[PDB]
Amino acid sequence: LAPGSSRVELFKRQSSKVPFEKDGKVTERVVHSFRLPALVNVDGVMVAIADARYETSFDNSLIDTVAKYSVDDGETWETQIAIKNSRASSVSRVVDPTVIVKGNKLYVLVGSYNSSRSYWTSHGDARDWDILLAVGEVTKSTAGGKITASIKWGSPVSLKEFFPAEMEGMHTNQFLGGAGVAIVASNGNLVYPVQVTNKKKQVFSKIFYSEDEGKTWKFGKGRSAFGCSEPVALEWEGKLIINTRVDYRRRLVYESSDMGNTWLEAVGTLSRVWGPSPKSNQPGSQSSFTAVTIEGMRVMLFTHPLNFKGRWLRDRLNLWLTDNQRIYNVGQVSIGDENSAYSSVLYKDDKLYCLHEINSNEVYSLVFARLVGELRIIKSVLQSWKNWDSHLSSICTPAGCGPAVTTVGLVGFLSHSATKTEWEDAYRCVNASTANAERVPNGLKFAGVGGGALWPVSQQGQNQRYHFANHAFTLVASVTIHEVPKGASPLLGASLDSSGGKKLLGLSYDKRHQWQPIYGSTPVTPTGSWEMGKRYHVVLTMANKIGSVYIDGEPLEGSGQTVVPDERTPDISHFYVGGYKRSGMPTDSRVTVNNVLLYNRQLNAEEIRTLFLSQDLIGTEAHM
Numbered sequence: 001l002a003p004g005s006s007r008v009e010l011f012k013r014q015s016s017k018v019p020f021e022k023d024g025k026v027t028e029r030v031v032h033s034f035r036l037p038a039l040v041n042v043d044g045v046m047v048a049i050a051d052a053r054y055e056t057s058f059d060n061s062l063i064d065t066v067a068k069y070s071v072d073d074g075e076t077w078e079t080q081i082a083i084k085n086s087r088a089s090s091v092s093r094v095v096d097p098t099v100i101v102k103g104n105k106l107y108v109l110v111g112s113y114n115s116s117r118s119y120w121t122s123h124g125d126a127r128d129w130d131i132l133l134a135v136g137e138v139t140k141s142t143a144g145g146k147i148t149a150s151i152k153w154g155s156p157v158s159l160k161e162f163f164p165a166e167m168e169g170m171h172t173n174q175f176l177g178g179a180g181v182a183i184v185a186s187n188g189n190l191v192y193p194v195q196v197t198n199k200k201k202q203v204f205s206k207i208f209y210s211e212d213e214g215k216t217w218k219f220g221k222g223r224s225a226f227g228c229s230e231p232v233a234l235e236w237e238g239k240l241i242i243n244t245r246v247d248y249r250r251r252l253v254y255e256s257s258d259m260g261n262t263w264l265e266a267v268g269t270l271s272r273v274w275g276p277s278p279k280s281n282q283p284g285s286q287s288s289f290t291a292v293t294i295e296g297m298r299v300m301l302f303t304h305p306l307n308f309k310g311r312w313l314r315d316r317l318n319l320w321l322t323d324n325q326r327i328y329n330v331g332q333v334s335i336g337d338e339n340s341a342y343s344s345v346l347y348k349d350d351k352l353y354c355l356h357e358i359n360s361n362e363v364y365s366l367v368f369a370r371l372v373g374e375l376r377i378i379k380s381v382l383q384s385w386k387n388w389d390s391h392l393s394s395i396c397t398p399a400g401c402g403p404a405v406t407t408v409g410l411v412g413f414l415s416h417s418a419t420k421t422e423w424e425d426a427y428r429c430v431n432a433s434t435a436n437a438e439r440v441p442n443g444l445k446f447a448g449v450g451g452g453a454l455w456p457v458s459q460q461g462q463n464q465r466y467h468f469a470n471h472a473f474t475l476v477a478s479v480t481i482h483e484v485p486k487g488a489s490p491l492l493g494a495s496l497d498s499s500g501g502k503k504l505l506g507l508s509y510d511k512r513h514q515w516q517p518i519y520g521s522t523p524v525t526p527t528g529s530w531e532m533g534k535r536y537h538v539v540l541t542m543a544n545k546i547g548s549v550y551i552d553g554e555p556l557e558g559s560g561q562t563v564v565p566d567e568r569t570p571d572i573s574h575f576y577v578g579g580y581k582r583s584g585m586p587t588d589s590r591v592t593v594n595n596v597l598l599y600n601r602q603l604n605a606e607e608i609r610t611l612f613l614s615q616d617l618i619g620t621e622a623h624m
């Protein structure tokens with residue numbers, strides 16, 4: 001939890017009571033565990049929705065949906081049961097409450113089970129299952145001269161009639177919300193991303209939506225891959241971005257422009273960025289994933305545990321910030337090594353909050369954290385993003401002024417700022433490690449075995465912000481060679497392996513004053529000519545499985561070669577700059593590199609020309 005931030009145990013395990021209703025009697029009843037946080041703002045009233053697991057944290061046990069609500073931003077709360085289970089047996093339950101706010105109404109979608117003791121995807125049929133929608137209406141008033149609120153909950157309505165018996169290629173079984181908070185789309189639709197099972201017990205994600213305030217519901221025709229569960233969605237630039245849990249794998253993210261009729265994996269942005277554990281080989285989690293506007297900029301906030309401990313313990317809840325280009329780790333919201341899986345982040349009246357689980361010995365509480373420090377950090381990073389983008393766009397490029405320098409898809413920028421061991425990203429997301437580097441205006445001068453910079457791709461580890469590069473990228477730099485090498489030496493490239501020996505696309509230079517562009521594992525043909533001490537502009541582009549190399553805005557002879565040989569997707573280890581930064585490699589690159597730009601797409605010819613013409617205008621030197 002950041003400096004300046006603080007929390008309380010709001011839903012306290014084995015302590016907090018809720019109004020348990022049965023057979024017309026209400027009794028204040030202590031709850032064993034609280035799970036499934038959803039934290040929202042309803043027209044000024046903060047509402048926290050959760051599971052009240054009365055007897056045990058076991059998933060398949062007695063559970064009602066609880067709400068707490070506050071009119072004073074969480075200083076005090078009132079408590080109610082929003083949705084009661086069927087009371088059919090000792091384990092009846094309403095589950096995984098998923099919330100949409102529209103106007104002064106909360107729409108809460110829950111599964112309902114009567115008597116099963118088995119995990120939902122293990123059920124061979126829907127004998128025990130229903131899917132219910134309850135609506136809460138929030139009214140504000142002023143008793144005793146003070147602002148008050150109340151929430152009146154409707155009786156739940158089954159949406160089972162809207163679940164078709166078949167979906168292409170399958171027979172349907174059950175579906176549930178993806179927990180947390182869903183959305184109202186820009187056309188007014190209520191949109192729940194849902195997790196669905198078929199009779200083969202496969203799980204997949206769909207979009208489940210309503211055009212008439214929840215009276216009737218439709219499924220979008222498309223779907224995720226099998227294995228994509230518990231989805232969470234937001235709307236971004238006219239599209240749904242649907243962010244899915246995949247147990248034992250990296251999270252898949254999809255886009256859909258047509259209310260889920262067609263799903264496209266978001267390979268160029270967010271898909272496969274977030275891993276569920278260090279080695280992405282453990283269970284995944286529910287995630288908060290929201291679009292908000294902070295100081296005038298639309299951005300997304302994402303949470304997920306790092307899960308160093310493994311299995312479902314899911315320690316180390318982390319918060320991420322992205323503009324759909326750059327991806328910034330705000331940091332750890334939870335405290336120390338506590339277990340902290342499910343979460344919900346709310347941005348209300350320019351204050352940031354998080355309701356999340358803490359788990360000791362499978363006894364769960366929800367803490368309510370005031371993310372004061374995290375908001376400060378987020379505002380700082382966004383100011384940096386805005387400022388660098390403004391600055392680059394403002395430059396009057398050489399013909400009045402030529403086309404603007406493009407900042408669309410500009411993810412990273414290595415320029416003047418460097419510490420002894422790192423070359424700093426101006427966008428503050430991913431620094432490059434360095435060795436044997438000397439600071440120069442807007443870059444670094446390198447020498448010696450082991451020398452260079454490493455800008456990590458898969459080497460980022462669990463969370464891979466530059467995964468897009470496996471699909472398309474542009475890497476740009478200004479270079480000067482200071483000594484003729486003994487053989488062929490590296491200058492810039494994308495490496496498939498950790499050494500740099502196995503390249504996707506690169507540029508080397510040789511003892512005969514020629515360039516050696518490297519296209520995957522294709523035999524290298526030297527070409528062109530360079531002069532010691534002269535500065536050159538280098539662009540490497542990769543898209544559509546094809547790699548190109550440009551010097552001074554022009555493609556080397558024979559460029560435009562296939563670099564992805566066989567339909568496996570690349571797994572780029574890192575970009576290397578100014579050497580390999582590997583003492584295991586015998587090369588000595590004596591070179592200066594300035595102003596390294598990374599984009600998440602293949603730039604066009606105009607954009608490349610503009611960068612070349614503008615290369616002495618773009619550095620960060622005069623600003624820090």
Ligand SMILES: *[C@]1(C(=O)O)O[C@@H]([C@H](O)[C@H](O)CO)[C@H](NC(C)=O)[C@@H](O)[C@H]1F
Binds near residue numbers: 195229286341
């Ligand atoms: C979370 C959890 O991992 O801790 O998992 C849910 C599902 O297993 C997940 O959505 C994949 O289907 C549980 N839901 C149900 C209905 O079992 C959550 O309650 C929670 F358990």
Ligand SMILES: [Cl-]
Binds near residue numbers: 169170172200
């Ligand atoms: Cl099936």
